[PDB]
């Protein structure tokens, strides 16, 4: 906290990797043997050898991921398009990347029009398209890191909020695992910066044996390895016309972050009935179970949801450090005290402030999160819980204590002030008491910066529980953003669920004998997915009929909506599926002579196959 304030005086060219000259068989290299953080000060590597013989495979991998050689063997660059610090240009040309439009499925559009759709004055219309971008879009989108400013925190209050958050994250287990227990899916994805010139992640997960991976992972508990992050543009459907960009982290960072965090990440995504709902599905009655869990037994229930403007471009560094420290608290037996600090330093040097490669040039990332590391959603959930806790603390500590009728709450406020500003060490009994109070009067359900809260209403009116205004104030003074209350909702009737959670609305329908909650999407999104595609994937439905089956699975609960076009969407999808099947069979029987059969294929255009996906009895 003090280093953050003091680092704003010193010049910005004295931060980052520290390099020196080493000799390998009489030839000189330039490698990084330390780091200078704005928050953590000066860090020196522990195992550095100047004179050495011919190097091995993992040394080649480490030296090929360091930005030192790439920056030192490049040209100077002065870029006036952005205000962020610039390092070097790797080539003699600047690359401009564009985004192409979508492909039009005319047959589906004609079929939909021939059934009374897209008429004037209708309540269902297309507002999801593929937007195109011009040459200078990647740099324009990268220039949004100017909203990240150095922020000092109230340390005596953060040191209590972190205890409450750790109480929230208490029902799991974690630790370190060996290289043979790591689970990777889709090994056919990109590998990072230097490495995408020779293969995908399969090449590097096959060429490296198990003890090589173990030695590489054990190397990062005594040294710091800075890497390079590549920025890519997305090609997907959306409702707004701004460019979207994701970050591609290097393989040397992901390979070790998996071994560090995967056990805890898998343990979190396997628990039901907790605050974090990552891993729970919405089919087979999952949505109803989540909604019933979040309602708990609150006394005067209302519902509330909020929004984070520029969530990843504006999150201060201190909260990211806090999230990493909270996640790394499960290593009390497998790791020492220096190993944990060096792991934290490696994480900070790789995914918090490092060189990014936009276009064909190297830039310096000021701060924030790089969406695309191995621990994105869980860290976002920790950050969301931290913000909710500090909002509750600020709401309770800023109330006239002479007007609180209940004496228990008055004593709680007195003890809260004493534990914040008059106590130096942790007091577990009051932490447990405050955690119980929060869980009784303020219930949460969190999924990576999306949240729904069921709170006591009279307590919030009297000021003993956080409100929207408290969230606005906390965001203003701790996140450097303004949160307009036009993107937040409030629901005073519990028979209708949250107004929006994970882009889905909620309706209470009668199925069987009882009443359950079902989610339904926006009809415009489903129709836009039907009509606008990437080529070959559609514009010929017979080649892929399984797209429309999934799209009709997503659009089933629209048949219980009081509005009439909403069910017509599902019926139109069923008729299109039947038409595509008939087209395929006849269109194949005609020129060729192969005769097709309709055995157990009619199930796809009858509603009973889709009705079974929302009825509790987990058949897969």
């Amino acid at each position: 906290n003090f280093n953050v304030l003091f680092s704003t005086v010193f010049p910005p060219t004295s931060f980052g990797p520290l390099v020196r000259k080493i000799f390998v068989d009489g030839v000189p290299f330039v490698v990084s043997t330390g780091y200078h953080f704005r928050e953590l000060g000066v860090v020196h590597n522990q195992d550095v050898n100047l004179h050495s013989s011919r190097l091995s495979f993992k040394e080649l991998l480490v030296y090929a991921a360091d930005p030192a050689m790439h920056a030192a063997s490049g040209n100077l660059l002065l870029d006036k398009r952005t205000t962020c610090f610039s390092v070097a240009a790797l080539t003699n040309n600047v690359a401009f990347q564009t985004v192409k439009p979508g492909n039009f499925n005319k047959d589906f559009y004609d079929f939909a029009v021939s059934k009374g759709f897209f008429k004037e004055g209708s309540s269902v219309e297309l507002k999801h398209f593929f937007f195109a971008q011009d040459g200078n879009a990647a740099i324009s989108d990268y220039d949004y890191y100017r909203y990240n400013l150095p922020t000092m925190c109230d340390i005596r209050q953060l040191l209590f909020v972190v205890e409450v958050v750790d109480k929230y994250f208490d029902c799991y287990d974690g630790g370190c695992i060996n290289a043979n227990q790591v689970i990777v899916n889709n090994l056919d994805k990109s590998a990072g910066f230097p490495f995408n010139k020779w293969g995908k992640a399969r090449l590097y997960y096959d060429s490296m044996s198990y003890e090589d991976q173990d030695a590489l992972f054990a190397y990062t508990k005594r040294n710091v390895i800075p890497t390079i992050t590549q920025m890519n543009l997305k090609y997907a459907i959306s409702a707004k016309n701004r460019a979207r960009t994701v970050a591609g982290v290097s393989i040397c960072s992901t390979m070790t972050n998996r071994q560090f965090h995967q056990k805890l990440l898998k343990s979190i995504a396997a628990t039901r009935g907790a605050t974090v709902v990552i891993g729970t599905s919405k089919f087979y009655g999952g949505w109803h179970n989540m909604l019933k869990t979040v309602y708990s037994d609150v006394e005067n229930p209302h519902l509330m949801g909020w929004d984070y403007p520029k969530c990843d471009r504006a999150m201060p560094n201190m909260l990211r450090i806090m999230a990493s420290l909270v996640l790394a608290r499960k290593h009390t037996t497998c790791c020492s005290l220096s190993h944990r600090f060096y792991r934290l330093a490696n994480e900070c040097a790789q995914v918090l402030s490092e060189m990014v490669m936009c276009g064909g040039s190297l830039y310096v990332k000021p701060g924030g999160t790089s969406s695309g590391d191995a621990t994105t959603a869980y860290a976002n959930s920790v950050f969301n819980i931290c913000q909710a806790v500090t909002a509750n603390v600020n709401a309770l500590l800023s109330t006239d204590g002479n007007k609180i009728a209940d004496k228990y709450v008055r004593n709680l406020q007195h003890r809260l002030y004493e534990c914040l500003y008059r106590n130096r060490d942790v007091d577990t009994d009051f932490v447990n008491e405050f955690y119980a109070y929060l869980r009784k009067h303020f219930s949460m359900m969190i999924l990576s910066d999306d949240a729904v809260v069921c709170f006591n209403s009279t307590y919030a009116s009297q000021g003993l529980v956080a409100s929207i205004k408290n969230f606005k104030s906390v965001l203003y003074y701790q996140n450097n953003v303004f949160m307009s209350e036009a993107k937040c909702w409030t629901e005073t009737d519990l028979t209708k669920g949250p107004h929006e959670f994970c882009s889905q609305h909620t309706m209470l329908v009668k199925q069987g004998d009882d009443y359950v909650y079902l989610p339904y999407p926006d009809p415009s999104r489903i129709l836009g997915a039907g009509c606008f595609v990437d080529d070959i994937v559609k514009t010929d439905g017979t080649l892929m009929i399984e797209r429309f089956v999934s799209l009709a699975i997503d659009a089933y609960p629209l048949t219980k909506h009081p509005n009439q076009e909403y069910a017509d969407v599902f019926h139109l999808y069923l008729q299109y599926i039947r038409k595509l099947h008939d087209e395929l069979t006849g269109h194949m029987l005609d020129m060729y002579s192969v005769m097709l059969t309709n055995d157990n294929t009619s199930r796809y255009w009858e509603p009973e196959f889709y009705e079974a996906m929302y009825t509790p009895h987990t058949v897969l």
Partner: protein, 187 residues
């Protein structure tokens, strides 16, 4: 599947038993036929099953070892490629200015952000518009980072040569404006 060790015995016993049956002998020879053929087929059963299990096991082993060999070959070639890339990028370090600024350090360590700033030979500037251009690289030589640079070439967003005589205020709206200026360190 036809020349198994027990096949000869099984077939010979079957042929002899069926010849005895075709001889129309008493029921005792028929009972002996049935017992002998039953035990013969029973003993042929495992000899026909175990061999088929073993062949599939051997085939799986062969496939796994082949894929291991392919993985090793790929590892060797990627190692060669990485070594070549490193030794190729080594040859542009300008080993006199770099040595001159390394020796001035009190322990050999220097920040990475000041190596291109003090040892690079070429500079690239990207200019949004003309107002920014006339404040940064006006003329033929300009000063930046406490050094003197002289212009060598100017191209546009389409990578076509542009002469400085036509970068003016009147002619500004006729150029693909993300201009890139290349200069060399003077003296």
């Amino acid at each position: 599947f036809s020349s198994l060790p027990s096949y000869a015995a099984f077939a010979t016993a079957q042929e002899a038993y069926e010849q005895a049956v075709a001889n129309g002998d008493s029921e005792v020879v028929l009972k002996k036929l049935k017992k002998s053929l039953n035990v013969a087929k029973s003993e042929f059963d495992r000899d026909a099953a175990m061999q088929r299990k073993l062949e599939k096991m051997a085939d799986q082993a062969m496939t796994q070892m082949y894929k291991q060999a392919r993985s090793e070959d790929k590892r060797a070639k990627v190692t060669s490629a990485m070594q070549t890339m490193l030794f190729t990028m080594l040859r542009k370090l300008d080993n006199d200015a770099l040595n001159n600024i390394i020796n001035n350090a009190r322990d050999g360590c220097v920040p990475l952000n000041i190596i291109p700033l003090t040892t690079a030979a070429k500079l690239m500037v990207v200019i949004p518009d003309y107002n920014t251009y006339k404040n940064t690289c006006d003329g033929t030589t300009f000063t930046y980072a406490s050094a003197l640079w002289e212009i060598q070439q100017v191209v546009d967003a389409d990578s076509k040569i542009v002469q400085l005589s036509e970068i003016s205020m009147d002619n500004s709206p006729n150029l693909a404006w993300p201009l890139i200026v290349t200069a060399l360190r003077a003296n």
